[PDB]
Amino acid sequence: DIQMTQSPASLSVSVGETVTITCRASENIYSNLIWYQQKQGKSPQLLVYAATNLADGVPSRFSGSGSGTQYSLKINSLQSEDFGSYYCQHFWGTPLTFGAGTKLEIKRADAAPTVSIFPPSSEQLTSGGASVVCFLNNFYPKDINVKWKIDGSERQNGVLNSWTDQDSKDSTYSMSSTLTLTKDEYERHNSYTCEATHKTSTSPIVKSFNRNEC
Amino acid sequence: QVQLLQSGAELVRPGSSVKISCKASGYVFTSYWMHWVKQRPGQGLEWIGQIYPGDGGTHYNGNFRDKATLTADKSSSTAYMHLSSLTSEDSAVYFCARKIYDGYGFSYWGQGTLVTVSAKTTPPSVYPLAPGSAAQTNSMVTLGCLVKGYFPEPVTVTWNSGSLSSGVHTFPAVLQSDLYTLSSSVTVPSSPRPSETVTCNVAHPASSTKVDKKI
Amino acid sequence: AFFPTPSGSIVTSESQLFNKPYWLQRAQGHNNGICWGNQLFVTVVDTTRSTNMTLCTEVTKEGTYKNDNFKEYVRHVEEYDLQFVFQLCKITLTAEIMTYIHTMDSNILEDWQFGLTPPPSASLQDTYRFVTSQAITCQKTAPPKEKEDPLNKYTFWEVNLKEKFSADLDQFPLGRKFLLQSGL
Amino acid sequence: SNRYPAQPGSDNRECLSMDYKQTQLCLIGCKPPTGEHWGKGVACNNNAAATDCPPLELFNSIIEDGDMVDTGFGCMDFGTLQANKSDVPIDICNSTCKYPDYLK
Amino acid sequence: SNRYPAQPGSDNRECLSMDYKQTQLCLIGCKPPTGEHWGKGVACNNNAAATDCPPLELFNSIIEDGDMVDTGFGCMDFGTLQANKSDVPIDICNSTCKYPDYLKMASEPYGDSLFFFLRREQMFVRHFFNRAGKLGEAVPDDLYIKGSGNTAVIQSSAFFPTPSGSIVTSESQLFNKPYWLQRAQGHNNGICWGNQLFVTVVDTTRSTN
């Protein structure tokens, strides 16, 4: 097989900039590349064939380039209909391989998160559980790391996370982070918190709760 | 007019065999090779094979060798793939591929087919989540509602049955131990709490337990 | 149960029947060239110029051959040409002639649009003419339809020559060959 | 060399290609030319020791465009006279090649 | 004999040798002699075509020197329509073999490409080979009856003949004999405008190696 190394993993861009996605293989394929567009909840759609030739219906912002072992596509004045997830595909070889996939995201100025911690629900305590959840809401960028802590000592196991897609309104993300623990582990320790690292503040977001307080 | 119909959702058990098919029209079926593909979630596509309805000459991938049996039928104008002894790492989406008669790349696709492997379905339960008595009164108070532990998709959750619901990030269902867990948290001004006392309703296109809880 | 396979032989360039003039001076019937109804029916068969060029369309291209990377067609092309030369001839239409053409065809004499023809001169029998509008003993009411031609069911290569006449011959191939025969 | 015994089997049908008898002709006229072909017809009343044999009769028609000419397989119908459909090539398999009557 | 079922493997390309149809011709002109060939063109790309067959188009070009003559395989461009480059003999792999159009030059009113023309061709078939690959239009169902077992795969029926030549005598030559232009066929009865003439020959009875 000839594997493909598509880079970057994503890009934050606004309307108008000149964009470039890297697409590189192992063997000299002779300009037999296909680029593609996928939006959310949708199927791929034909953009360019044989790395220079456009198929029908498309505007002239897309332009292909490159020869040899490297190729890249150029879009000038990028528009709101172009946002989605991408794939560059070579088509010689047993077997055919595809692109790594870049999700073409929107650019926005950064805003610090609004994160709020909660004590667990009393309905789980009767059945015998206690789920500790830290909701990470309305920040930027998507990359963020969350720290779970018990009695000042951090915990790595049982951590379950959730990310959402980019909102189409203000280009935000909202993250749900969950730590799951039993009934007997819950009543013994009293200090639990989440501390999320970010670029907007050097110190992490401090949100804690105690069982004796509430 | 050319079209490739595809069934969207398909639920199965691990270690069994499932018959996935897509329908062909708008062109003459015997004049084109057909390919099938797999996009691993969190990964790119993977090409599996190459099949012709005219003679039946097959082609597989070596990493799919003995895993899929590419066979078709020409009367009803459809092609099949049939994964044998399915495991959890092939829980993914699938299309069947149509190129131009030249055949550089794939011009038309199908719709998609996501497969999931599990033993039994289970209905969830909804839990109310109240804030803490710390974190003193600023402008916005963020609430909580948490459904947990269900199979399968889909599930709907609405605040006040859709009355005041504007600005809630309904979080995606994460699958851990064949049960999905979803969450939702509303942003709201501080004054209608505890005035309106917003509720969290669950509707389930399934066994269909409709539960309401006060937040 | 036997059957043989015919093949045919070499095809020269002197055993042809086309690309040549053919004058007529005496047809083998009593119709000495005249075409009533202003149409002809020319039919030819050739099996000598019957080649079959074959196409080749590729799938995926690289310098190591695999036989499934190509998908071929089979096509075949044939053309023709027709050329004519016609001659204006008149019919004097008197009493003893229209009785002759009437027995050959009806469609000729109506298509000069100069009169109508009562088909009998009367008949002898009563033919049992009813008037009471059909409620006693059913008869075959036989609604007619002329249908304007008999050949309209079939399919031909229709060619038109309504806009391709000329009066000056020698600006064409056939005129320059025909005039050298006649000496005019 | 067609020796003995015959090799048994359910089907020995294969792929072959053959050529055609070369022919050139030309007919004109004021009324379109008429051709003919053999064709299966009607039998008679009940006959005791008669074998199963389809009767053969003449049919006159008008030579439509596209129909084939004879090619050394006789001027006969091929649709309703071959059940197996595997004796002539594709170009004459379900078609009825005629031939004009120079006598009539 | 072509037995069932199919024996071979992935690629079964062969090495073979043939010859061509013998062709003698001779022309005379003051303008150069034109000619044509079958070549590709554009299609109608608003209709949802069931098959997307390459359309074909006639091209009246002007004959250059070194362009090959018809070799019985038809007058097409083998450069762009034989993508596998490996189904015609070597010499005709990457060019176009034109053929004259007599019925066009004669119908030109000034008649300044033909003063005199002659031709002799003959051809028959020696062997029969079938091509390989997948048929574009596979055969429809109601003209055959299927089977089972060794009759599983339909054999690809792309048949092509081979040209064979013939005998070549010396009674049927066309050269070393004079030709007096008693009367040309067009209107230009021998006049050579612009102080030039264009003769052309294609002879392939004297082509030893």
Residue numbers in the entry:
A (entry chain L): 1 to 214
B (entry chain H): 1 to 215
C (entry chain A): 290 to 473
D (entry chain A): 133 to 236
E (entry chain E): 133 to 341
What do the paper's sentences say?
Human papillomavirus type 58 (HPV58) is associated with cervical cancer and poses a significant health burden worldwide. As has been widely reported, HPV virions are composed of the major (L1) and minor (L2) capsid proteins, which surround the 8-kb closed, circular DNA genome to form a T=7 icosahedral capsid ∼60 nm in diameter. Five copies of the L1 protein are intertwined to form a capsomer (or a pentamer), with 72 capsomers undergoing self-assembly to form one capsid, also termed a virus-like particle (VLP), that is composed of L1 only. Each L1 structure comprises eight antiparallel beta-strands (BIDG and CHEF) in the form of a jelly roll structural motif which is maintained by connections among the BC, DE, EF, FG, and HI surface loops.
We found that nAb 2H3 had the highest inhibition rate (87%) in its recognition of an immunodominant epitope. Finally, we determined the structures of HPV58:5G9-2fold, HPV58:2H3-2fold, and HPV58:A4B4-2fold at resolutions of 6.41 Å, 3.64 Å, and 4.19 Å, respectively. The density map for HPV58:2H3 showed that Fab 2H3 binds to the distal tip of each capsomer, but with a different binding occupancy within one asymmetric unit (six monomers are designated monomers 1 to 6) in pentavalent versus hexavalent capsomers. For nAb 2H3, we inspected the two binding Fabs astride two neighboring pentamers and found that these two binding sites allow full-length 2H3 to bivalently bind the HPV58 capsid. For the HPV58:2H3 immune complex, Fab 2H3 interacted with only two L1 monomers (monomers 2 and 3). However, compared with 5G9, 2H3 interacted with more loops of the PsV58 L1s—BC, EF, FG, and HI loops—with a total buried surface area of ∼1,122 Å2. Eleven hydrogen bonds and a salt bridge network are established in the interaction. Indeed, 2H3 appears to neutralize infection by prohibiting the binding of HPV58 virions to the ECM and the cell surface; in contrast, H16.V5 blocks viral binding only to the ECM while still allowing cell surface association. Thus, we propose that 2H3 may serve as a physical hindrance to block the loop movements necessary during viral infection by interacting with multiple loops from two neighboring L1 monomers. Considering the immunodominance of the epitopes recognized by 2H3, this nAb may be an important candidate for assessing the integrity and antigenicity of HPV58 VLPs or future vaccine products.
